[PDB]
Amino acid sequence: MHVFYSEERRGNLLILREGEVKHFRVRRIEKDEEFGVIHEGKIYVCKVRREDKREISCEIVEELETKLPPKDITLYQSVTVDLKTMDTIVRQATELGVLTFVPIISERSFQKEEAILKKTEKWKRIVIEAMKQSRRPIPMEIKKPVRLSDLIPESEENIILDNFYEGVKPKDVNLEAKTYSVVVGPEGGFSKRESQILREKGFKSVLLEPYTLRTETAVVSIVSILMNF
Amino acid sequence: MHVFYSEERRGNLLILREGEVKHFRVRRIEKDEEFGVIHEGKIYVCKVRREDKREISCEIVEELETKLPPKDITLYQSVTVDLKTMDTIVRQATELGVLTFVPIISERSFQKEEAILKKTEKWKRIVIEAMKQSRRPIPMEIKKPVRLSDLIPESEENIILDNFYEGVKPKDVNLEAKTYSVVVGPEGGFSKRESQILREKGFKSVLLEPYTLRTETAVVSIVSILMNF
Ligand SMILES: Nc1ncnc2c1ncn2[C@@H]1O[C@H](CSCC[C@H](N)C(=O)O)[C@@H](O)[C@H]1O
Ligand SMILES: Nc1ncnc2c1ncn2[C@@H]1O[C@H](CSCC[C@H](N)C(=O)O)[C@@H](O)[C@H]1O
């Protein structure tokens, strides 16, 4: 079934607005077909109650069962120099089930902060689009950028993806942790220097196989491993 | 270092051409600088013999060992209706170590075989840039298209990624099979019918956690898990 996101409910009715009425519109959707609507926590199976052109109402036919992410991952991403690449990594972090997304400024990452801050609004909307197709009940929190030199390992287990270092495989890390910190570098990668600071602070360094991946194919690569295990 | 591609080796000199030359100069390589060139199954570390107006000769200094994929994966990707998507799926398939890529014609996927055969050339070239960037010397073979109906569990472990069926957990698959066969669906997934046919054969259905992912994200997820063992 199709899925939409509503930010307002009255009694047992969810209301779509703006972008949603368009999305829902292009979707013909016979007068009474069941489509989902995630609202403040869960997703609700609904049938149209009345359709406009500016706003639409849906009636809750059933509390749909919504699963949560087995692990609480906080992906610390080094902002790619090509910000569009960050559009993917954000949508994807979302479908994969990442609870938190933190942009990082590293020696080789995009450097401007304001541009990163202004990119948030779009980071956010993309999350929404993603929790609709992904049917993800809750959102992915996008945070204010933090400097790579300020990271501290704080999760049950803490990883740093590095292709330059001869690290351990994911299997070797504590895959039985409930919360994780995962630091991925930009297109240019991590400087031998800055990653040494990290392994020293405690971030366990993982080496994926069998080649060098673009930063985004590396992100899903490991998140996939850390969420499915 | 910088890795380039070559299909011309006159002597101990690996010649570069067309776009591979525009990249070389756009990289202002300083004389005696060290870079690599992939040729006939392996990468050689080379120092620039001389960048000609057209060609660009590269002197071989040492034949580097090639690191082959720990697993033998054959990807069966249902061509996505949005063909630009196959651009990234062929790419990521490549840097992940997938050996064979087979485009599939399924009920809810792209259909025009004629187009699939043509956009294939574009893909073969997306592979070379992916080999160069992922220091990958072994070529991913893109085969002629085939439809689901004709698929065969030719490999040891044969999987079918489906979000519609409560298949097995990724962690419970033969994570130590030598060869593999992964079948992924187009945007609309696999219909109960087609999947049930594939499962009807030896194809083991797998379910990823915890949400529904777009095809490209799933391709990465299943293979990132299998390759990193
Ligand atoms: N094989 C691998 N194992 C672990 N991490 C990888 C990886 N391949 C890529 N990554 C991740 O992707 C990020 C950017 S890849 C940077 C590659 C570098 N420019 C080079 O020339 O080799 C890396 O910092 C790391 O976080
Ligand atoms: N969680 C998951 N488990 C297994 N396979 C998945 C998956 N999420 C996506 N896929 C793969 O990605 C393909 C396209 S996603 C299909 C989603 C489906 N049309 C829907 O809206 O419900 C699926 O057919 C499957 O091959």
Residues B138 and B222 in one domain: yes
Nearest CB among B169, B209, B212 relative to A133 is that of B212
Cβ–Cβ contact B163 with A under 8 A: no
List, as one string, the DSSP characters of B150-213: G----SSEEEEE-SSS--B-GGGS-TT-SEEEEEE--TT---HHHHHHHHHTT-EEE--SSS--
- Can the peptide bond before residue B70 be classed as cis, meaning omega within 30 degrees of 0? no
Closest CA to ligand 2's atom 12: B215
Q: Which residues are CB-contacts of A106 (< 8 A; sequence separation ≥ 6)?
A: A78, A148, A185, A186, A190, A191, A194
Distances, alpha carbon A93 to alpha carbons A88, A101, A155, B114, in Å: 8, 8, 18, 35
**Same domain? B203 vs B90:** yes
A96 in reach of chain B (CB within 8 A): yes
Q: Which one of A95, A211, A219 would you mutate to disrupt binding with B, by most B Cβ within 10 Å of its Cβ?
A: A211
Q: What is the CATH number of the domain that holds B78?
A: 3.40.1280.10
Distances (CA, A) of B106 to A205, B116, B141, B221: 41, 13, 20, 21
Question: Which among A70, A220, A222 has CB closest to B210?
Answer: A70
For residues A18 and B175, what is the distance between their CA atoms, to the nearest angstrom? 47
Are residue B117 and residue B223 in the same domain, yes or no?
yes
In this structure, the answer to whether residues B118 and B167 fall within a common structural domain is yes
For residues A154 and A209, membership in a common domain is answered with yes
Taking CB atoms and an 8 Å limit, are A221 and B220 in contact across chains? yes
Contact B97, B54 (CB under 8 A): no
Q: In terms of domains, do A101 and A28 share one?
A: no
Residue where one domain finishes, among candidates A35, A66, A97: A66
Task: Tell me: do B202 and B116 sit in the same domain.
Answer: yes
Query: Hey, what long-range contacts does B139-144 have (CB within 8 A, 24 or more apart)?
Result: B139/B41, B140/B90, B140/B93, B140/B94, B140/B98, B140/B99, B140/B100, B140/B101, B141/B99, B141/B100, B141/B101, B142/B90, B142/B101, B142/B102, B142/B103, B143/B100, B143/B101, B143/B102, B143/B103, B144/B117
Domain boundary among A66, A97, A123: A66
Tell me which of A77, A92, A158, A161 to substitute to probe ligand 1's pocket, judged by most ligand atoms within 8 Å of the beta carbon: A161
Nearest listed ligand to the Cα of residue B210: 2
Tally of structural domains, chain B = 2
Considering the domain architecture, whether residues A191 and A151 belong to the same structural domain is answered as yes
* Ligand showing the shortest atom-to-Cα distance for residue A221: 1
Residue A103 belongs to what H/E stretch?
A: strand A100-105
Same domain, A46 and A86: no
A95 to B224: CB separation less than 8 angstroms, yes or no: no
In terms of phi and psi (left: phi > 0; alpha: psi -120 to 50; beta: otherwise), the region of B163 is: alpha
On whether any CB of chain B is under 8 Å from the CB of A228, the answer is yes
A212 C-alpha vs ligand 1 centroid, how far in Å?
5
Tokens of B152: 């065969």
Side chain identity at B140, as an amino acid letter? M
Domain check: are B55 and B71 in the same one? no
Which ligand number lies closest to the CA of residue B92?
Answer: 1
Residues B14 and B80 in one domain: no
Residue A31, domain CATH: 2.40.240.20
**What experimental approach yielded this model?**
X-ray
**What residue type is A164 in one-letter code?**
F
Among residues A66, A81, A107, the one where a domain terminates is: A66
Query: For residues A69 and A94, what is the distance between their CA atoms, to the nearest angstrom?
Result: 10
3-state secondary structure at position B85: helix
Q: Is B18 on the interface with A (CB under 8 A)?
A: no
DSSP-derived pairing of the beta strands A9-10 and A13-17: antiparallel
> Do A59 and A135 fall into the same domain?
no
Cβ-Cβ contacts under 8 Å, B228 against chain A: 169-171, 208-209, 221, 225
Range of the domain at B185: 67-229
